[PDB]
Design a protein around this ligand. Sequence first.
Ligand SMILES: [N+]
Length: 175
Amino acid sequence: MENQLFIIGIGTGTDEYENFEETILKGVKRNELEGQIGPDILDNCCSDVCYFWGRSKETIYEKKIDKGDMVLFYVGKRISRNKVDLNQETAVYLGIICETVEISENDVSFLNDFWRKGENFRFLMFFKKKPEKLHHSINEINSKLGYNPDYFPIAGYVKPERMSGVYDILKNILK
Ligand SMILES: [N+]
């Protein structure tokens, strides 16, 4: 595996989902970022509107998130540590990272334009195409990956021995 696969769990009914809807599902016009994100990033990675997500750290499970890495956004009702409510609606989105941008702690104010508490989430990942809504539930994707059906991490790293089982499917979705 030359790239990595991460799972990010977006809890519905929380500010996290509101932020996700804003910048991953809807996206933002490029002019909302001009003056704050360098034009190189915007040129290379905003195909029309810009799509991006942000986190408090550069790493997940101690793995650095790199451009070219893939992200499964799990969307559902968080009901316990690492568990989703499978009797409520769930969704999964698949993105591939075009670029990563670390915003300095001193430069986070613009993130509040877009996100509740945005200034906390200064490790940004950009997606050139809107992450693709998959046909499958969280429980079907977890099953294919060998996880328990209701697995719902805040941030998870999919080890290569598991990622390998689904890697060719994921590449074909994203092509
Ligand atoms: N908007």
